Design a protein around this ligand. Sequence first.
Ligand SMILES: [Zn+2]
Length: 118
Amino acid sequence: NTALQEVLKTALIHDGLARGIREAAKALDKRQAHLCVQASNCDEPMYVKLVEALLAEHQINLIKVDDNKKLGEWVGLCKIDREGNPRKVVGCSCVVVKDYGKESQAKDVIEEYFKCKK
RNA sequence: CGGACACGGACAGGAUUGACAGAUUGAUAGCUCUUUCUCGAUUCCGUGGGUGGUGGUGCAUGGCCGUUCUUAGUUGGUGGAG
Ligand SMILES: [Zn+2]
C-alpha cells in the first residue's frame, strides 16, 4: 500500500531519468541502471519487447504502470500549475534512476523487488 | 546568430546540437549533399516584441572644438533724459 503510491514519488526530485523523444529507450545500454519503470499502455508490443530484451536477463527491474502521460507529472516537466495549462506533456515510457542521492524513502521500492522476484 | 522575452505549436511510440569518409568548395565552412552515428529539453517553428548598425539626418540635438576674436570688449542696480 506504500509501494505504488508515494515511494516512487520520492525518487523523482532531482534524480537522473530519461527526458524527451531521443533518450527514453536509451539508458539500458549503460551500467548505471537502477530501478526503471515502463508503461502498460505502449502502442507497440516491440518497445516493451526491447526493454525486456535487456533487463529480464540482467540486473534491472521494470515496474508496469498504467500509461506514460501519467509519468509526465513524474519526470520533471511540470505542467500542473496555477496559471498554466495542466496538459502539456506526452510523458515518458521508460525512465531510469542513475543514483538516489538521498536515502529518505528508497527502501520500499527495492523491498518490492526481492519480495517476489527474488 | 551573438533574433532577449510573451503566447501557441512542435513535442518521450522520436523537438534539437555536433560530426569521419568521399563528387561538394576558394576553404579540413557537416556550407550543402550521399550514408550514418552522436547531443539531452538545451532548442526548433509560427506571431508579437526586443536587439544590433563606422545605416541616414550635425539644418532634430548634447558634449567638445574651431571661429568673427588676440582685438579691448560687455552688463545690471539706483538716479537723470525721453
Ligand atoms: Zn539612410
